[PDB]
């Protein structure tokens, strides 16, 4: 059933699974009209579909043209997400298809279940974890490819870069969630932490800087501090 703290290690076993986050599928700017009413303007979005074991991010870019002439966009966006995840699964060889799909928001359950009726053996699951995948748009290279898209497009990224050469998927996921939680809580500070040192670069084929093991511990500490810091700034503690 629901994925939570009690069964967290299940994420890193050898049953193929995907997280699906739909937060950034339908994105808008709200603005005033000449007449002084309010309107929205859509901008490009993305489905965040992630294998937590391997770091495989299938980033389906959602181009604003998909909303043209459509009504009830926040509802459509869930069904569009489900249609695109179902299309992704059907595109994979059988031995690569997931056994479970975990949605980060419960409103994706029925749309995804209905789109996956053809896959009765794929379990569609919610989670009680508050995962920070909305902050994916705070990763510069992901934001860049989404905003530049002129048409629907799927882009592939290892969200762990090469970390699995040195650490387990449990530890890589924990690092990822810490980074994304930081970026979500205070993007400016988080990005300052990550880039303040010009000698540490991001490889062309990576998302995050090339920290040594020792530097990752420093970095991870700074992200915790930031999250605890902002938690006081917010609550006055």
């Amino acid at each position: 059933g629901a994925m939570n703290s009690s069964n967290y290690a299940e994420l890193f076993n050898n049953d193929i699974k995907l997280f699906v986050d739909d937060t950034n599928v339908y994105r808008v700017t709200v603005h005033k009209t000449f007449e002084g009413n309010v309107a929205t303007k859509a901008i490009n979005g993305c489905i965040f579909t992630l294998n937590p074991k391997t770091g495989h991010l299938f980033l389906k870019i959602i181009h604003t043209s998909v909303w043209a002439g459509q009504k009830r966009l926040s509802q459509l966006a869930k069904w569009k997400t489900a249609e695109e995840v179902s299309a992704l699964v059907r595109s994979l060889p059988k031995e690569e298809q997931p056994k479970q799909i975990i949605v980060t928001r419960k409103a994706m359950l029925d749309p995804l279940e209905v789109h996956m009726l053809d896959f009765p053996n794929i379990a569609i699951r919610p989670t009680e974890l508050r995962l920070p995948f909305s902050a994916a748009m705070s990763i510069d290279k992901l934001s860049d490819v989404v905003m530049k898209a002129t048409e629907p497009q799927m882009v592939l990224f290892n969200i762990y870069d090469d970390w699995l050469d040195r650490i387990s998927s449990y530890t890589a996921f924990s690092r990822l969630t810490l980074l994304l939680r930081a970026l979500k809580t205070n993007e400016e500070s988080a990005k300052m932490i990550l880039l303040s040192d010009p000698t540490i670069t991001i490889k062309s084929y990576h998302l995050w800087p090339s920290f040594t093991d020792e530097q990752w511990i420093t970095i991870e500490s700074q992200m915790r501090d930031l999250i605890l810091t902002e938690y006081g700034r917010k609550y006055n503690v």
Binding site: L76, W79, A82, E83, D110, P111, E113, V114, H115, L117, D118
Partner: protein, 300 residues
């Protein structure tokens, strides 16, 4: 007017006949029910005084044969049987009437309740839901499960209601996933009405039969079916106008007849609130919404 004689009443029992009921004491001189209106199905039902476990009963139509009730001390229940010897039966009934050992079906002349609850219910369709083809009447009890309940375990004793499942390939056209899930008109009108039921009369008949088994036997799977069939219509944007008007009448009389103290188990809060206030047909069930709001305003 027809008659269902009883051989005897050896155990204390509450006997129902349609929406009526009366208490019979152990070895009281009771020999059946007379003046039963011809033209409708009927249900005769039982709850033993010593064990309210298992309400049970029989759906029958007196036009289809001469039926009587006889207690079986081995199986421990009142059984319906058919008497094939017409002269024997007529002679039995006439004697029991002459000795006035029969209760009269107590229908008030003004009162259309039973007609309104059984308008579309036919014995031939009951017998396809309740399979026991060697009898002209159909046994139902509180514990019998539905075909759908058994897919989620004795097949011979099942209620074979039409399976309705809103998250199923039958309900959902490939490529119309969002459309068909949010507007069930395809599933209602093409799959169920045109495809399975053939017409709305048969649909309403099963809906009414499911309600009556829920009310009279506390049959939980029947209650599930009744609510599913309501929800499928209410969740369809495109429903023939005559079906909506008739549905409103059907549900009105069901809600009217429901015992007040059973509303908590016989009525599904989610389905009714959705149907009356959120669904496409939220404004199409005037009679049903008015009686629900005046009789069960708590549920809503």
């Amino acid at each position: 007017m027809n008659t269902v004689p009883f051989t005897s009443a050896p155990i204390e029992v509450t006997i129902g006949i349609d929406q009526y009921s009366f208490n019979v004491k152990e070895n009281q001189p009771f020999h059946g029910i007379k003046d039963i209106p011809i033209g409708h199905v009927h249900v005769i039902h039982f709850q033993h005084a010593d064990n309210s476990s298992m309400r049970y009963g029989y759906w029958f139509d007196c036009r289809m044969g001469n039926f009587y009730i006889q207690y079986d001390p081995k199986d421990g229940l009142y059984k319906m049987m058919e008497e094939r010897d017409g002269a024997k039966f007529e002679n039995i009934v006439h004697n029991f009437k002459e000795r006035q050992m029969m209760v009269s079906y107590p229908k008030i002349d003004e009162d259309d309740t039973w007609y309104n609850l059984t308008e579309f219910v036919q014995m031939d369709k009951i017998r396809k839901i309740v399979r026991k083809d060697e009898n002209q009447f159909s046994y139902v009890d509180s514990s019998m499960t539905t075909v759908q309940e058994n897919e989620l375990s004795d097949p011979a004793h099942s209620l074979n209601y039409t399976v309705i499942n809103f998250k199923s390939r039958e309900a959902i056209r490939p490529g119309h996933e969002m459309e068909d899930f949010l507007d069930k008109s395809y599933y209602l009108n093409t799959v169920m009405l045109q495809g399975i039921f053939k017409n709305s009369s048969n649909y309403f008949g099963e809906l009414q039969f499911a309600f009556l088994n829920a009310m009279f036997f506390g049959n939980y799977g029947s209650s599930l079916q009744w609510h599913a069939m309501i929800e499928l219509i209410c969740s369809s944007a495109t429903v023939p106008k005559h079906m909506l008007d008739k549905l409103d009448e059907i549900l009105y009389y069901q809600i009217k007849t429901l015992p007040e103290q059973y509303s908590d188990i016989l009525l599904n809060e989610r389905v009714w609130n959705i149907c009356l206030y959120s669904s496409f047909q939220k404004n199409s069930l005037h009679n049903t919404e008015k009686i629900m709001e005046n009789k069960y305003p708590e549920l809503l």
